[PDB]
Amino acid sequence: MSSELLDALTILEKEKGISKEIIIEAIEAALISAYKRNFNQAQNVRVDLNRETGSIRVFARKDVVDEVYDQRLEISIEEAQGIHPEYMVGDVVEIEVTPKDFGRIAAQTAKQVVTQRVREAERG
């Protein structure tokens, strides 16, 4: 379901000099950017697109520190241990922060991105 993007990229691959490998990066940058508008100066984030199952997952990257130093975004060393005690002060932790409506948005973002590569590629 909503895995049309998978075929969208392939269509571009058929073209010479148009590596679809780089196209996949466009979709991600789009989805992450779209959600970033919600909290850009509030906190960072890293989206990971999976062309294998046409799925998508948004995770927030927080700075693991013994004590909160960045009011904008930070995670207590003890907090990260709650889900992964393997963490350590100075590392980074990722937590699901994607909306429950991202399911449809994913295709809407990937469909709009792949489409741009088509009109753009022919553009020059």
From Swiss-Prot:
Superkingdom, taxonomy of origin? Bacteria
Localization per record: Cytoplasm
Q: What family is reported?
A: Belongs to the NusA family.
Q: Describe its function.
A: Participates in both transcription termination and antitermination.
The record describes its quaternary structure and partners as: Monomer. Binds directly to the core enzyme of the DNA-dependent RNA polymerase and to nascent RNA.
Q: What protein does this entry describe?
A: Transcription termination/antitermination protein NusA
Q: Which organism is it from?
A: Bacillus subtilis (strain 168)
Organism ancestry: Bacteria, Bacillati, Bacillota, Bacilli, Bacillales
Q: Which gene encodes it?
A: nusA
Give from-to of the shown chain within the full protein: 1 to 124 of 371
